[PDB]
Amino acid sequence: ISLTSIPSLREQQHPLIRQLADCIEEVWHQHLDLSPYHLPAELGYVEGRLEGEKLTIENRCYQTPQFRKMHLELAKVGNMLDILHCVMFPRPEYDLPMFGCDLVGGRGQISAAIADLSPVHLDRTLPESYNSALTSLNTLNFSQPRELPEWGNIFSDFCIFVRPSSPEEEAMFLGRVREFLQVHCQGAIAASPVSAEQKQQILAGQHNYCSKQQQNDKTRRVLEKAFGVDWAENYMTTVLFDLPE
Structure with missing residues (x-):
């Protein structure tokens, strides 16, 4: 609605992570026709705490005529x-x-x-x-x-x-x-x-891929520890591995 830009988290991260993020986005842009894909406002950028440490999550999504969702x-x-x-x-x-x-x-x-x-x-x-x-x-x-x-x-x-x-x-x-x-x-x-x-x-x-991933992805435990069990459940099923409808 009114937006500020801040730098990407990827600058604070392990260099391979930064390089992969840049590389994934660069190939997407070069070959595909990208539009924004919107997540609920609250979920594009997430801040929390874990054992005193800052937790940050930065979500970026796109769509194309062939892809429902492209999520980084x-x-x-x-x-x-x-x-x-x-x-x-x-x-x-x-x-x-x-x-x-x-x-x-x-x-x-x-x-x-x-x-x-x-x-x-x-x-x-x-x-x-x-x-x-x-x-x-x-x-x-x-x-x-x-x-x-x-x-x-x-x-x-x-x-x-x-x-x-x-x-x-x-x-x-x-x-x-x-x-x-x-x-x-x-x-x-x-x-x-x-x-x-x-x-x-x-x-x-x-559907099979997404349920197996939901059931078994390990980021869940991290998210539970940060925000509780329901928040983590919701995030797994609506942000990370949402069923194709």
């Missing part, structure tokens, strides 16, 4: 915790996978980095064009991979889940996230809407 979340808890979270939710008329990536860190280290193009079918197949493109990519040599949890059958075979040990690995990870985004943007630009029947299915796959 940055969070910071004093200097104990840095988080980047990113999800792209296609419109269910489009046979597109779900792009997601997460970075968790604190203290000049990163403990967890994940990136995927997660399938919208239960069989776990991606479209053909994605398969060729992703398989064509140089296979990357990560030293400290991590095992997906058993609720993680929502992820594709290309999913990357690592703890980056060096800045070489950090750069490898960032490079790969970028490749995923480029392939995904090309995918989106080439997609035609499907029949009202296939859209019913696309809508099941997304």
Whole structure:
């Protein structure tokens, strides 16, 4: 209604987080036709406290003709915790996978980095064009991979889940996230809407992805500790992993 600009949280964050945020937004802008997507005013920028430390959450969302919602979340808890979270939710008329990536860190280290193009079918197949493109990519040599949890059958075979040990690995990870985004943007630009029947299915796959993510994302615990259980529940179901209707 009346707005002030302040600098982005990403300036106070681990450099890989800043670089990824800038990179995600740069690819979005370059390939897609972005409009604002509005969250309730109260939720674009969130301040709280946790063990005396300042908690900050900065949310940025967009939409396109192909994407219902493109969400970039940055969070910071004093200097104990840095988080980047990113999800792209296609419109269910489009046979597109779900792009997601997460970075968790604190203290000049990163403990967890994940990136995927997660399938919208239960069989776990991606479209053909994605398969060729992703398989064509140089296979990357990560030293400290991590095992997906058993609720993680929502992820594709290309999913990357690592703890980056060096800045070489950090750069490898960032490079790969970028490749995923480029392939995904090309995918989106080439997609035609499907029949009202296939859209019913696309809508099941997304529903599956979002419920599994709600049930299991770990930011929940952080949010509960900051704001209580209901606030955290509401945030999980209406901001982070909202059901496609």
